[PDB]
Design an enzyme around this catalytic site. Structure first.
Site, PDB file in Angstrom:
ATOM      1  N   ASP A  12     -30.580  50.692 -44.850  1.00 57.87           N
ATOM      2  CA  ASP A  12     -31.595  50.945 -43.841  1.00 57.87           C
ATOM      3  C   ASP A  12     -30.980  51.743 -42.709  1.00 57.87           C
ATOM      4  O   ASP A  12     -29.848  51.487 -42.295  1.00 57.87           O
ATOM      5  CB  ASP A  12     -32.196  49.676 -43.273  1.00 57.87           C
ATOM      6  CG  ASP A  12     -33.427  49.930 -42.428  1.00 57.87           C
ATOM      7  OD1 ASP A  12     -34.466  50.294 -43.022  1.00 57.87           O
ATOM      8  OD2 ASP A  12     -33.339  49.791 -41.196  1.00 57.87           O
ATOM      9  N   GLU A  14     -31.930  53.481 -38.700  1.00 59.89           N
ATOM     10  CA  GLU A  14     -32.770  53.762 -37.543  1.00 59.89           C
ATOM     11  C   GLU A  14     -32.640  55.247 -37.205  1.00 59.89           C
ATOM     12  O   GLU A  14     -31.641  55.878 -37.555  1.00 59.89           O
ATOM     13  CB  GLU A  14     -32.388  52.943 -36.308  1.00 59.89           C
ATOM     14  CG  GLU A  14     -32.230  51.438 -36.553  1.00 59.89           C
ATOM     15  CD  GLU A  14     -33.498  50.654 -36.890  1.00 59.89           C
ATOM     16  OE1 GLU A  14     -34.595  51.243 -36.843  1.00 59.89           O
ATOM     17  OE2 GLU A  14     -33.390  49.437 -37.216  1.00 59.89           O
ATOM     18  N   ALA A  15     -33.654  55.798 -36.530  1.00 62.51           N
ATOM     19  CA  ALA A  15     -33.634  57.193 -36.128  1.00 62.51           C
ATOM     20  C   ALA A  15     -34.357  57.379 -34.794  1.00 62.51           C
ATOM     21  O   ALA A  15     -34.949  56.438 -34.253  1.00 62.51           O
ATOM     22  CB  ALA A  15     -34.260  58.047 -37.206  1.00 62.51           C
ATOM     23  N   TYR A 115     -38.439  57.680 -45.441  1.00 61.27           N
ATOM     24  CA  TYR A 115     -37.579  57.608 -44.270  1.00 61.27           C
ATOM     25  C   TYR A 115     -36.111  57.817 -44.645  1.00 61.27           C
ATOM     26  O   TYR A 115     -35.555  58.886 -44.392  1.00 61.27           O
ATOM     27  CB  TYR A 115     -37.784  56.268 -43.565  1.00 61.27           C
ATOM     28  CG  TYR A 115     -39.200  56.048 -43.064  1.00 61.27           C
ATOM     29  CD1 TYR A 115     -39.832  56.989 -42.265  1.00 61.27           C
ATOM     30  CD2 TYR A 115     -39.875  54.873 -43.331  1.00 61.27           C
ATOM     31  CE1 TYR A 115     -41.122  56.799 -41.810  1.00 61.27           C
ATOM     32  CE2 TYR A 115     -41.155  54.656 -42.858  1.00 61.27           C
ATOM     33  CZ  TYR A 115     -41.777  55.622 -42.094  1.00 61.27           C
ATOM     34  OH  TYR A 115     -43.055  55.421 -41.649  1.00 61.27           O
ATOM     35  N   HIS A 171     -35.497  43.969 -35.772  1.00 60.61           N
ATOM     36  CA  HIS A 171     -35.406  45.168 -34.957  1.00 60.61           C
ATOM     37  C   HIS A 171     -34.038  45.861 -35.065  1.00 60.61           C
ATOM     38  O   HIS A 171     -33.754  46.723 -34.246  1.00 60.61           O
ATOM     39  CB  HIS A 171     -35.789  44.862 -33.501  1.00 60.61           C
ATOM     40  N   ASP A 176     -32.860  44.402 -41.099  1.00 56.89           N
ATOM     41  CA  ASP A 176     -33.775  44.905 -42.105  1.00 56.89           C
ATOM     42  C   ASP A 176     -33.164  44.779 -43.500  1.00 56.89           C
ATOM     43  O   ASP A 176     -33.824  44.321 -44.428  1.00 56.89           O
ATOM     44  CB  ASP A 176     -34.246  46.313 -41.776  1.00 56.89           C
ATOM     45  CG  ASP A 176     -35.241  46.398 -40.620  1.00 56.89           C
ATOM     46  OD1 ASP A 176     -35.911  45.366 -40.325  1.00 56.89           O
ATOM     47  OD2 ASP A 176     -35.300  47.467 -39.979  1.00 56.89           O
TER      48      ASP A 176
HETATM   49  C1  LIG Z   1     -42.471  50.678 -41.159  1.00 58.05           C
HETATM   50  N1  LIG Z   1     -41.125  50.424 -41.607  1.00 58.05           N
HETATM   51  C2  LIG Z   1     -40.064  51.261 -41.351  1.00 58.05           C
HETATM   52  C3  LIG Z   1     -40.210  52.371 -40.509  1.00 58.05           C
HETATM   53  C4  LIG Z   1     -39.134  53.225 -40.284  1.00 58.05           C
HETATM   54  C5  LIG Z   1     -39.226  54.380 -39.321  1.00 58.05           C
HETATM   55  N2  LIG Z   1     -38.244  54.243 -38.245  1.00 58.05           N
HETATM   56  C6  LIG Z   1     -38.559  53.283 -37.188  1.00 58.05           C
HETATM   57  C7  LIG Z   1     -39.797  53.640 -36.398  1.00 58.05           C
HETATM   58  C8  LIG Z   1     -40.965  52.918 -36.607  1.00 58.05           C
HETATM   59  C9  LIG Z   1     -42.123  53.214 -35.911  1.00 58.05           C
HETATM   60  C10 LIG Z   1     -42.138  54.242 -34.987  1.00 58.05           C
HETATM   61  C11 LIG Z   1     -40.987  54.970 -34.771  1.00 58.05           C
HETATM   62 CL1  LIG Z   1     -41.028  56.246 -33.609  1.00 58.05          CL
HETATM   63  C12 LIG Z   1     -39.817  54.675 -35.468  1.00 58.05           C
HETATM   64 CL2  LIG Z   1     -38.371  55.594 -35.208  1.00 58.05          CL
HETATM   65  C13 LIG Z   1     -37.029  54.830 -38.201  1.00 58.05           C
HETATM   66  O1  LIG Z   1     -36.187  54.469 -37.422  1.00 58.05           O
HETATM   67  C14 LIG Z   1     -36.705  55.917 -39.177  1.00 58.05           C
HETATM   68  C15 LIG Z   1     -35.621  55.770 -40.035  1.00 58.05           C
HETATM   69  C16 LIG Z   1     -35.298  56.819 -40.864  1.00 58.05           C
HETATM   70  F1  LIG Z   1     -34.220  56.693 -41.675  1.00 58.05           F
HETATM   71  C17 LIG Z   1     -35.984  57.998 -40.901  1.00 58.05           C
HETATM   72  C18 LIG Z   1     -37.040  58.105 -40.046  1.00 58.05           C
HETATM   73  F2  LIG Z   1     -37.725  59.274 -40.034  1.00 58.05           F
HETATM   74  C19 LIG Z   1     -37.432  57.104 -39.185  1.00 58.05           C
HETATM   75  C20 LIG Z   1     -37.944  52.932 -40.918  1.00 58.05           C
HETATM   76  N3  LIG Z   1     -37.756  51.887 -41.724  1.00 58.05           N
HETATM   77  C21 LIG Z   1     -38.785  51.055 -41.950  1.00 58.05           C
HETATM   78  C22 LIG Z   1     -38.411  49.858 -42.799  1.00 58.05           C
HETATM   79  O2  LIG Z   1     -39.334  49.189 -43.322  1.00 58.05           O
HETATM   80  O3  LIG Z   1     -37.174  49.642 -42.952  1.00 58.05           O
HETATM   81 MG   LIG Z   2     -36.067  51.098 -42.463  1.00 60.33          MG
END
Ligand SMILES: CNc1cc(CN(Cc2cccc(Cl)c2Cl)C(=O)c2cc(F)cc(F)c2)cnc1C(=O)O
Ligand SMILES: [Mg+2]
Ligand SMILES: CNc1cc(CN(Cc2cccc(Cl)c2Cl)C(=O)c2cc(F)cc(F)c2)cnc1C(=O)O
Ligand SMILES: [Mg+2]
Lengths: 210, 210
Positions: A12, A14-15, A115, A171, A176
């Site tokens: 997993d 975060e970004a 993601y 979080h 995760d």
């Molecule tokens: C709905 N579930 C997820 C959502 C994200 C997307 N996010 C978090 C995020 C959620 C909402 C609004 C925002 Cl602004 C952001 Cl940043 C990320 O951190 C994320 C990471 C990646 F590897 C590339 C990506 F494009 C986004 C990542 N993972 C999961 C999961 O289930 O593990």
């Molecule tokens: Mg994720």
């Protein structure tokens, strides 16, 4: 003609934001589990023997307010903690960690297709390491868990349906991965069967951008 | 003429037995915390921003029954999980992980002088990497916590005296590091002051053997 996956790497990231924002990695967690932990095993404890890597990463731009609210990270805080960018040393570290695991490797990430997988490929592409993980495989756990269950298919919603409480630490990247592992341990033989049948070469994942 | 330690790397290893047995590493955990997490912070939660590496290692010999009882590891089980020995790739991985942290680095280990530091130096010496961590510093947290408190000075005994419950997962390297971190967060400014005043070059640690 790949065989059975020997290591499942629960993964997993975060970004800084969602894909349409051209995001950058801020945190990553890899939790490598040998197939024997699933094949030959209220909430199951993690296997005693696992390898784990959890790293924060300085992105080259600000996180969105929404990203910061949901991830608990910001670019300024990462910088205060002396975090380095996604660079050659990081790519090398990731590969050295993966090399400690028996092949074939399968990355397992929740909504990984949307993601985690394309963003990882984009980061590696920016370094000119476009084939670094060509030998790895990957599965999206939402695709797997849907297929197996056959409502919400978020980690929290699945976990609560399976176990009763809510997961801990929803979080963080590590939180995760640990929740995902717990879900995968519910019916582990079936999960493992599905992964072996459906694992895709990581090389077929297009970079999120660039 | 070293300055203030920028990263505290909470460190714990498991091994095949106690020093007089010529032991080998079976598990290691590094939890790198930036000084700002202690300087500018019932039981405190860990900092949001940390780096963590937890790895199992195949030793070249059997664990003693006592070692297996207390660590929950055995050589045969490590082998079933495909673990690799303490080799050049491992040393490189450790260094790449440390290089992601701002210097100076200080390893912090409970009874580190007796156990973790000399065994790490012995493993590195066997690979001919006798100076790989010459730039790091180290402190033994039992020495620190004794000095600061000024009975039992085990992790569990300290933790219980400070917090009330018992620590979680006393039987893994990661569990030990996390408990140590929690203890170090009790009076973190004082702990950090003590480390800066007493940190020793890692190069002064003699290998446990060889
Ligand atoms: C709905 N579930 C997820 C959502 C994200 C997307 N996010 C978090 C995020 C959620 C909402 C609004 C925002 Cl602004 C952001 Cl940043 C990320 O951190 C994320 C990471 C990646 F590897 C590339 C990506 F494009 C986004 C990542 N993972 C999961 C999961 O289930 O593990
Ligand atoms: Mg994720
Ligand atoms: C009493 N507290 C500790 C004891 C050990 C020694 N052990 C565990 C062990 C305990 C009893 C009997 C046995 Cl037979 C074994 Cl093996 C190690 O695993 C160990 C690791 C080292 F890095 C080099 C070493 F020589 C031993 C390690 N750490 C702590 C700690 O407080 O973190
Ligand atoms: Mg120890």
């Amino acid at each position: 003609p790949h065989g059975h996956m020997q290591t499942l790497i629960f993964f997993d990231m975060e970004a800084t934001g969602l894909p349409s924002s051209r995001p950058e990695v801020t945190e990553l967690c890899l939790l490598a589990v040998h197939r024997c932990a699933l094949e030959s095993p209220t909430v199951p404890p993690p296997p005693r023997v696992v390898d784990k890597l959890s790293l924060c990463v300085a992105p080259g731009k600000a996180c969105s307010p929404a990203a910061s609210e949901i991830t608990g990270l910001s670019t300024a805080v990462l910088a205060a903690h002396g975090r380095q960018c996604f660079d050659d040393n990081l790519a090398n570290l990731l590969l050295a960690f993966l090399r400690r695991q028996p092949q074939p490797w399968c990355l397992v990430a929740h909504n990984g297709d949307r993601y985690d997988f394309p963003l990882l490929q984009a980061e590696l592409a920016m370094l000119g390491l476009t084939s670094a993980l060509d030998g790895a495989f990957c599965v999206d756990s939402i695709t797997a868990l849907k297929a197996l269950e056959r409502k919400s298919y978020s980690l929290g919603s699945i976990y609560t349906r399976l176990y009763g409480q809510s997961p801990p630490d929803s979080h963080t990247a590590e939180g995760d991965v640990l929740a995902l592992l717990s879900i995968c341990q519910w019916r582990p033989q079936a999960l493992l069967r599905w992964v072996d049948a459906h694992a895709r070469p990581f090389g077929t994942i297009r970079p999120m951008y660039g």
